[PDB]
């Protein structure tokens, strides 16, 4: 067993290098490795591996007082030296962390003693503590497990301070975690967690029905949503649906014809019946999104005007811009050119395909010819990084990334958002203001800058917001209520109490 559970994940957890990305899975890195400060649902951080901290008047020098009772799972001590060596290991690979502005802000990290850790920054970077709280990269592996005094070229054993220890991994089969019996904090009620590798959502549903697994936990792609709805009525099962955690949208390429035209992007934003899309493809399980960030997101309650479903207005906008229908044709033309837009998505993702088909149908109704380009994952991500798309499915990152970290990353040219925004005359101003907002401690100016950035992105119709999506749970009733974590990408296994 009653203190052992079996769940599933589409892939293995990876080698659990705390400082690297794909194929490491963030929820699993968070099971084993811990931060200096821990993120809370109210947006603050609490003391964690660091007991307390102070900062200089200019806000550029921070000194953390560390706990002195923490051991890595292999018995070796956690101290300021171990922490400092981890920061070094991360920043020796600084280029790979460009998306995260703290990695560009840290100028020095040194252990002043066994318990005092000093971090110095380029500027007064306000999201400092929240980015220290992220699943990666600033969490701590035992320095003995460095390879050649680094982590960027690999690690030995994935030894953390966290409440879970990786027991064993079997590529394409399973991963097994066990409770850390020597954890500095509270002991998890669960003793053992087995992750079965099950890449297909239908197969995951079937695995639950047969009793092969005890728990499914994930976002809107966890299992088929019609099946989820059926499960929620099944008295043998338990299901949960969280409050929304992030946005799913479309990103429109402002630097590529015909989405380079504001009038076209505005029309597309009137063309989609989002409520119908959600009820049709998402089985009514998610919420309609009118803006890049939901009004509940910090700094994003701005009274931005929604573009409600209005095919008539969409047509009028296109007509006014010179996109008119030839005799006998349903696809508009201008200057000889047809109104043709390519929508790229992961071809094997049934949900994405379903939504893409609905979007194509809705846009054909207003005279736009959307071509569906379904491709493998690697090809879609390549398209995102180099801007080879007309429209592309995209999503925000949830707490604590939204909005500051998502906005920060809009400045990175190898990200979808930069590419989508590249055609805007105001793009340099936007990027300047993003840099400014991260470093201001004038709260009035900070809100003003967020308003200007988000309002320009909204008014320029860079995105086509679709849904605010939720976390979803399917479980054996004996496991009880399943909690959600403050960080959207983490799974609070240590909080489960049968
Ligand atoms: C569930 O995945 C995410 C949930 C919340 C935020 C992000 C954004 N990631 C941003 C950085 N990634 C790129 C991206 O998701 O666009 C990973 C990354 C960083 C540096 C170089 C490569 C890559 S992916 C090969 C954070 C992370 O992966 O730690 C997520 O990828
Ligand atoms: Fe990522």
Swiss-Prot record:
Gene3D superfamilies for the chain: Dipeptide-binding Protein, Domain 3 (3.10.105.10), Periplasmic binding protein-like II (3.40.190.10)
Entries under InterPro entries matching the protein: CntA-like, Peptide/Ni-bd, SBP_5, SBP_5_CS, SBP_5_dom
Main location: periplasm
Keywords: Nickel, Periplasm, Signal, Transport
Location relative to the cell: Periplasm
GO cellular component: ATP-binding cassette (ABC) transporter complex, substrate-binding subunit-containing; membrane; outer membrane-bounded periplasmic space; periplasmic space
One GO MF term: heme binding
GO biological process terms on file: negative chemotaxis; nickel cation import across plasma membrane; nickel cation transport; peptide transport
Family: Belongs to the bacterial solute-binding protein 5 family.
Function: Involved in a nickel transport system, probably represents the nickel binder.
PANTHER family cross-referenced by the UniProt entry: NICKEL-BINDING PERIPLASMIC PROTEIN (PTHR30290:SF37), PERIPLASMIC BINDING COMPONENT OF ABC TRANSPORTER (PTHR30290)
Name this polypeptide is given: Nickel-binding periplasmic protein
Gene (UniProt): nikA
């Amino acid at each position: 067993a009653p203190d052992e559970i079996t769940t599933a994940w589409p892939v293995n957890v990876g080698p659990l290098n705390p400082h690297l990305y794909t194929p490491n899975q963030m929820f699993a890195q968070s099971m084993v490795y811990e931060p200096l400060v821990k993120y809370q649902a109210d947006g603050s951080v609490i003391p964690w591996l660091a007991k307390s901290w102070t900062h200089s008047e200019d806000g550029k020098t921070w000194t953390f007082t560390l706990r002195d009772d923490v051991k890595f799972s292999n018995g070796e001590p956690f101290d300021a030296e171990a922490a400092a060596e981890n920061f070094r290991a991360v920043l020796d690979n600084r280029q790979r962390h460009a998306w995260l502005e703290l990695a560009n802000q840290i100028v020095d990290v040194k252990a002043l003693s066994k318990t005092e850790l000093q971090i110095t920054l380029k500027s007064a970077y306000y999201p400092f503590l929240q980015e220290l709280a992220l699943p990666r990269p600033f969490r701590f592996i035992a320095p003995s497990q460095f390879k050649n005094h680094e982590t960027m070229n690999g690690i030995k054993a994935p030894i953390g301070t966290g409440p879970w220890i990786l027991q064993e991994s079997k590529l394409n089969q399973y991963d097994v975690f066990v409770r850390n019996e020597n954890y500095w904090g509270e002991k998890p009620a669960i003793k053992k967690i087995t992750f079965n590798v099950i890449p297909d959502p239908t197969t995951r549903a079937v695995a639950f029905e047969t009793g092969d697994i005890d728990l499914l936990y994930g976002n809107e792609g966890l299992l088929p949503l019609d099946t989820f709805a059926r499960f929620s009525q099944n008295p043998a099962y338990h299901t949960q649906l969280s409050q929304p955690i992030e946005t799913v949208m479309l990103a429109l390429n402002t630097a590529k014809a015909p989405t380079n035209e504001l009038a076209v992007r505005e029309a597309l934003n009137y063309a989609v019946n989002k409520k119908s899309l959600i009820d049709n493809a998402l089985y009514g399980t998610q919420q309609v999104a009118d803006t890049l960030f939901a009004p509940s997101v910090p700094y994003a309650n701005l009274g931005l005007k929604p573009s409600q479903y209005d095919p008539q207005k969409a047509k009028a906008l296109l007509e006014k811009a010179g996109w008119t229908l030839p005799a006998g044709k349903d696809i508009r033309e201008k200057n000889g050119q047809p109104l043709r837009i390519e929508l790229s998505f992961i071809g094997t993702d049934a949900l994405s395909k379903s939504m893409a088909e609905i979007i194509q149908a809705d846009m054909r109704q207003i005279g736009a010819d959307v071509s569906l380009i379904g491709e493998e994952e690697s090809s879609i991500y390549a398209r995102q990084r180099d801007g080879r798309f007309g429209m592309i499915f995209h999503r925000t990152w949830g707490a604590p990334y939204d909005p500051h970290a998502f906005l920060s990353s809009m400045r990175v040219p190898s990200h979808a958002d930069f590419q989508a925004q590249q055609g805007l005359a105001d793009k340099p101003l936007i990027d300047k203001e993003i840099g400014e907002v991260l470093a201001t401690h004038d709260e009035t100016q900070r809100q003003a800058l967020y308003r200007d950035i988000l309002t320009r992105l909204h008014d320029e119709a860079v995105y086509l917001p679709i849904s605010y999506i939720s976390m979803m749970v399917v479980s054996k009733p004996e496991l009880g209520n399943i909690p959600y974590a403050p960080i959207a990408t983490e799974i609070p296994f240590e909080q489960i109490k049968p």
